[PDB]
Structure 1
Amino acid sequence: ATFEIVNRCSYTVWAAASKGDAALDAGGRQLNSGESWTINVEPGTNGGKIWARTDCYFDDSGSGICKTGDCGGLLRCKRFGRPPTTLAEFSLNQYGKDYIDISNIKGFNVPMDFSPTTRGCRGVRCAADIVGQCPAKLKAPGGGCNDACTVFQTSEYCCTTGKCGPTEYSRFFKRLCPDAFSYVLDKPTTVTCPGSSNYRVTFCPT
């Protein structure tokens, strides 16, 4: 499947793409404002994520640090990134269907639209100013708005027992971005698309 990753933000982001135990395609790249990066994701990829990282410094070996979404100090991510990270999530070719969502379960750093470029389903977006409105206790100094699980590490926020409800914090994310997951057991906002769809992830869509 092809994913075009577009940075519409006015600032540079460093895109990342991983399935947790491996890079997808090159795994990461710098995107200046306006740049587009086209990656190929193997059919049948399960549990892929794309995110933006902000305020990164990397040396000529591709080693360094980002203030949001850092994936163990690498430009080319093999692993998932450190919160806060707005997440585009997908599982492809799962019994004939692709499943896509945006998630705020690991917080929010950059607004995002995640849309098919082929026919047969709708996209999802979380484009509100979550960082600006972020509750004081969830504000990350590096930038971004952390989720409550990351900050407080309780069973309730992290849904460790598999039983948990919405919280004051999850409801903040949900009020600003209804079409994104706000906690682990949120009513799913997954979109079902035809198997083998292609997609575009746009940072700062509006």
Structure 2
Amino acid sequence: ATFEIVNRCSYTVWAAASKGDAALDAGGRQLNSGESWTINVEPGTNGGKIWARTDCYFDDSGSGICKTGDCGGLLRCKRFGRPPTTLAEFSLNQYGKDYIDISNIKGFNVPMDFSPTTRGCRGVRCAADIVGQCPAKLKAPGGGCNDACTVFQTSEYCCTTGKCGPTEYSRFFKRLCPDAFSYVLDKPTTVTCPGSSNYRVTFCPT
């Protein structure tokens, strides 16, 4: 499957793509404002994520640090990034179907649209100013708006027992972005697309 990753933000982002134990494609790249990066993701990939990282410094070897979404100091991510990260999540060719969603379960850093470029399903978006409106206790100094599990590490926010409810913090994310997951047991906002669809992830869509 082809994913085109587009930075429409006015600032540079460092895109990342991983399935948690491996990079997808090159795993990461700098995207200046307006740049597009096309990756190929193997069919059958389960549990893939794409995110943006902000305020990164990398040396010649591809080693460094980012203020949001750092993936163990690497330009080319092999693992998932440090919150806060708005996530585009996908599982491809799962019994004939692809499944896509946007999640705020690991917080929010950059607004995102995640849409198919082929026929037969809808896209999803979270483009509200979550950072500007972020509750004081969830604001990350480096930038972004953390989820409550990251910040407080309770069973309730992290849904550790597999029973949890919505919270004042999850409802914040859900009010601003209804079409994104706000906590682990949120009513799913997954979209079912035809197997082997292609997609575009746009940072700062509006």
* TM > 0.5: yes
Give the shorter-chain TM-score range. Answer: over 0.9
Identical-residue share of aligned pairs (%): 100
Q: Kindly provide the CA deviation profile for residues 137-178 of structure 1, in whole angstroms up to 9, marking residues without a partner as x.
A: 000000000000000000000000000000000000000000
Q: Structure 1 residue 89: deviation in Å?
A: 0.0
Between the aligned partners of 1:171 and 1:143, the Cα distance in structure 2 is 20
Q: Structure 1 residue 8: deviation in Å?
A: 0.1
Q: Secondary structure at the match of 1:44?
A: coil
Q: Kindly provide the CA deviation profile for residues 2-24 of structure 1, in whole angstroms up to 9, marking residues without a partner as x.
A: 00000000000000000000000
Kindly report the root-mean-square deviation, in angstroms, between the aligned alpha carbons of the 2 structures.
0.1
Q: Structure 1 residue 92: deviation in Å?
A: 0.1
Shift >6 Å, 4+ stretches: none
Q: Secondary structure at the match of 2:193?
A: strand
Q: Structure 1 residue 193: deviation in Å?
A: 0.1
Unpaired runs of at least 5, structure 2: none
1:146 lines up with 2:141 in the alignment: no
Q: How high is the TM-score relative to the length of structure 1?
A: 1.00
Between the aligned partners of 1:132 and 1:62, the Cα distance in structure 2 is 31
Q: How many residues align?
A: 206
Between the aligned partners of 1:90 and 1:116, the Cα distance in structure 2 is 12
Q: Kindly provide the CA deviation profile for residues 79-111 of structure 1, in whole angstroms up to 9, marking residues without a partner as x.
A: 000000000000000000000000000000000
Between the aligned partners of 2:66 and 2:191, the Cα distance in structure 1 is 30
Q: Structure 1 residue 129: deviation in Å?
A: 0.1
Between the aligned partners of 1:33 and 1:153, the Cα distance in structure 2 is 35
Q: How does 1:51-200 map to 2 (within 5 A)?
A: 51-200=51-200
Unpaired runs of at least 5, structure 1: none
Between the aligned partners of 2:154 and 2:3, the Cα distance in structure 1 is 35
Q: Structure 1 residue 27: deviation in Å?
A: 0.0
Q: Structure 1 residue 44: deviation in Å?
A: 0.1
Q: Structure 1 residue 65: deviation in Å?
A: 0.1
Q: Secondary structure at the match of 1:26?
A: strand
Q: Structure 1 residue 63: deviation in Å?
A: 0.1
Between the aligned partners of 2:191 and 2:177, the Cα distance in structure 1 is 15
Between the aligned partners of 1:44 and 1:14, the Cα distance in structure 2 is 25
Q: Secondary structure at the match of 1:163?
A: coil
